[PDB]
Amino acid sequence: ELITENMHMKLYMEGTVNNHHFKCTSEGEGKPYEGTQTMRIKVVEGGPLPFAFDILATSFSKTFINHTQGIPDFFKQSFPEGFTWERVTTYEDGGVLTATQDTSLQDGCLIYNVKIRGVNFPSNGPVMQKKTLGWEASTEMLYPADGGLEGRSDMALKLVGGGHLICNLKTTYRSKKPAKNLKMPGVYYVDRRLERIKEADKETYVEQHEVAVARYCDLPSKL
What we know:
223 residues; mainly beta; eleven-stranded mixed barrel; 2% helix
């Protein structure tokens, strides 16, 4: 009941990447049970950013994942209190983007607050040279650990000229609701696409869409 068929989102983000300070705000809507969502994002301080906006894409929403097969949904269960996430994204060319997030709910609106710290992005690498072209589809594996959920994913960033730069995501999701009141899932997987829909003014405005579906392994087992 707290999480309905159609929901809105509002976000505030601040941080630094290679010592460059910035702030973003965003507004969006989606369908939490269908796993679809759109964010319209503005860089409101420190624009235009000296790095590829793509490295911020995963920091803009776990309530909008279609949890199929009765998978207990840690995120939707966490309301009204909400949940937090803390992530480290490690790029294979050295860049490290750490992000911490709070998810709350007010007036049927999801409210996100994000803090970003990015360090060691190579100055001649595609992030700092802005030679990136968005993300391939990815799979996250989630599993219970110490009363929260851990997630892990490798993602591939498309590059001008056709190659890819890969990064690995390690995430800790923690509920603000007490353990008493939560049914934990076992190991499961979330497949997703994160797509750039529009950009304006050298990525000071960005529209991004995600579709995400959770599943167990659907393959036959001999055990």
